[PDB]
């Protein structure tokens, strides 16, 4: 029920949103893995540009 004054809100939480939740606790590990793969490819292509 509306209080005295405020904004009308439409939260999009009428589905089973708690089953599909993407936590980001693997973000630093993902960054580390991407780095390691990047340096591995850079070593693999010996004199070639690393960027491509």
């Amino acid at each position: 029920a509306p209080s005295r004054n405020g904004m009308i809100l439409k939260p999009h939480f009428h589905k089973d949103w708690q089953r599909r939740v993407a936590t980001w606790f693997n973000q630093p590990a993902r960054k580390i893995r991407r780095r390691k793969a990047r340096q591995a490819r850079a070593r693999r292509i010996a004199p070639r540009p690393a960027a491509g």
Binding site: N5, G6, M7, I8, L9
Partner: protein, 187 residues
Amino acid sequence: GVDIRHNKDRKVRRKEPKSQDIYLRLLVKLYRFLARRTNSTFNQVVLKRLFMSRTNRPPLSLSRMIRKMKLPGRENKTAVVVGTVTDDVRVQEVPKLKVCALRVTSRARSRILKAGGKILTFDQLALDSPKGRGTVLLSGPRKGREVYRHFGKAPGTPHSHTKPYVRSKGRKFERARGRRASRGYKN
């Protein structure tokens, strides 16, 4: 039994800053002493404004300060503001001023120093003028915050130019029934 009411018995004004930093509290000590051992009320006003909160110490712009100090009679006096002096970019000519403030923007300080004025802090202000003679006490626009556009007489009510709380501005958001004579009524 005494026929009295205790509703407004306790006054709500601030006795001390809610902040916890030490520099402001040292300033408060100094100006407490000055206010209670000097008859000048400038010290009392400055101490009271030191007590106040951030939203009650709005920033003062360079254009406002030069505009209020260019008035006749108040030449070569020190402009005292308890807030923050922010730079105004839509002003080219800046004179030499004697400013005192708690904190000054880097660009504003550069502008004043280049123009030739000097920046003072409330400590050195105490040394220069304990009772504060030759001071022009200014303040920023307190009603400048945008929250004040939502206050007052409610919208959707005749002769009320109050901003509603809308999540997005557009033609589909609060424009149909109470805002048009074509659809229902117009307030």
